[PDB]
């Protein structure tokens, strides 16, 4: 999980 900033 490398989710970008929203």
């Amino acid at each position, epitope marked *: 999980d490398y*989710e*970008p*900033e*929203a």
Partner: nanobody
Framework: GQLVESGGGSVQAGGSLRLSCAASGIDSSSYCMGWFRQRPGKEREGVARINGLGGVKTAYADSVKDRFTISRDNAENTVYLQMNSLKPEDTAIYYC??????????????????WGQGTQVTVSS
């Protein structure tokens, strides 16, 4: 694609209100979902947004940071706005919205495509 807000009402300064946004047609767990508001006599502005693709990261307008929390319950296909520490300045019609396609928000309020009819939030002193 339809979004329906509820949970609005008329509360007192310092209090809280929890708004809900029920999605239909689309699967909100997949989409960048947002809350916007239109304060009396002002243009619509972003309030909070949460990533799609099952993401959990969020962003907020400076005016509401630390007071409001957006979240999504994927099992209910519903997005929430938990509004704490309400101020009369938060009085507005609040709208739920989604970007056009599954994905991440990309750091902006642009390109929101589906919109609810809105729910009134009044905060009095």
């Amino acid at each position: 694609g339809q979004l329906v807000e509820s949970g609005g009402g008329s509360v007192q300064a310092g209090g809280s209100l929890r708004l809900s946004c029920a999605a239909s047609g689309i699967d909100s767990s997949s989409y960048c979902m947002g809350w916007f508001r239109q304060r009396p006599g002002k243009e619509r502005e972003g309030v909070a947004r949460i990533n799609g693709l099952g993401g959990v990261k969020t962003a907020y307008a400076d005016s509401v940071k630390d007071r409001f929390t957006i979240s999504r319950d994927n099992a209910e296909n519903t997005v929430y706005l938990q509004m704490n520490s309400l101020k009369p300045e938060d009085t507005a019609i609040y709208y739920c919205a989604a970007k056009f396609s599954p994905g991440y928000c990309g750091g902006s309020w642009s390109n929101f495509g589906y919109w609810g009819q809105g729910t009134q939030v009044t905060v009095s002193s």
